[PDB]
Amino acid sequence: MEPRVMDDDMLKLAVGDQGPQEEAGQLAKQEGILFKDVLSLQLDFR
Amino acid sequence: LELKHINKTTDLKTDYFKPGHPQALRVHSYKSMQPEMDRVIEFYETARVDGLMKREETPRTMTEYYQGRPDFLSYRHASFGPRVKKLTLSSAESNPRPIVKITERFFRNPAKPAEEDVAERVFLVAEERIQLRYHCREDHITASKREFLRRTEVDSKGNKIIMTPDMCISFEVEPMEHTKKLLYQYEAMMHLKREEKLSRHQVWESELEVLEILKLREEEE
Amino acid sequence: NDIETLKGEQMKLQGVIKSLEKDIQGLKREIQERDETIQDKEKRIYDL
Amino acid sequence: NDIETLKGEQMKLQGVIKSLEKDIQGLKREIQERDETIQDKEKRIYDL
Amino acid sequence: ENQEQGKRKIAKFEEKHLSSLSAIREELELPNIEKMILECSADISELFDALMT
Secondary structure: OOOOOOOHHHHHHHHHHHOOOOHHHHHHHHHHOOOOOOOOOOOOOO | OOEEEEEOOOOEEEEEOOOOOOOOEEEEEEOOOOOOOOEEEEEOOOOOOOOEEEEEEOOOEEEEEEOOOOOOEEEEEEEEOOOOOOOOOOOOOOOOOOEEEEEEEEOOOOOOOOOOOEEEEEEEOOOOEEEEEEOOOOOOOOOOEEEEEOOOOEOOOOOEOOOOOOOOEEEOOOOOOOOOOHHHHHHHHHHHHHHHHHHHHHHHHHHHHHHHHHHHHHHHO | OHHHHHHHHHHHHHHHHHHHHHHHHHHHHHHHHHHHHHHHHHHHHHHO | OHHHHHHHHHHHHHHHHHHHHHHHHHHHHHHHHHHHHHHHHHHHHHHO | OHHHHHHHHHHHHHHHHHHHHHHHOOOOOHHHHHHHHHHHHHHHHHHHHHHHO
């Protein structure tokens, strides 16, 4: 297998998959964690 | 019991006490022995664990003054409403006064900024609003004010009422970008609803403590 | 059994909301079939 | 606590049941509305 | 010394202006509202002149 190298695309992919949430909650998360203002990143088991 | 001062012109009885009481009585000023009357009860801080100084009880409102609390709570005041006429219960213990308004004023926390430390917190229970007035910074005159319309979790049609930004009214001296976030205000609603329930429970506990104090004083007399 | 049934409570609260939304989704499919009826008539009016 | 969550699950189960009850009747009225339009424009087909 | 004097004047104005805002939010008459807003602005000018002096 190939070890791929860590980039903004899977960074925002993990930002997407960490929280399912709701629609207004998703807008709240859009206002809360911008790409500048992500509070926490989890990229384990990739 | 140390001193009993009876003023006959105003029909006022004031009892001055000594330290070492189980309920830490210091001053009891009253006109009648019946509950839900005009009375002032003053306590001891070293013997009380909640840090309560004063409780003024009126037939409509109650007022508590504290000191030295870890949550910096200094002032509590609950305005009650008229009782609904229930034909099966006539006791004050069984028919509590419905809480309409609660106002809690908190001491300044130096560990918190002024714009985030809640100086005053008002629950209008009947109209279902929560108002926050934060502490004032030393380089400002007016303080940050926020108003929240606490809506029911279920509407008239069975749907969950989802949060909308038009409901939340916030007057901020400096506009924080993080306080306009919908998530932060939602966590604020969760914390504030929990605090409103806790404050209503504490006001009911204060009323029960008043009833216990009156029963104990009647037993002593 | 507390956690599972409370979880069953929360999905069922979402189930009531999504069933109200699935009513609208069911309408959207019937609007498409209405538009299919709209699409076939205008083609025959244009062929007219 | 298990019992009262199970009771809450049952009464919310009535919630989707009545909300689905609105769905099929909502489906069946528009089913006739699609069929009535097709019947009117297949009369138009016989005209063409 | 001057900073402490300014802080005391600021505190006195804060108390007076908080009372004035409580008077703002309860008044129902428009000319009274406008006049006491004018005296609020006069108080602002007075405090500004106090801190300048």
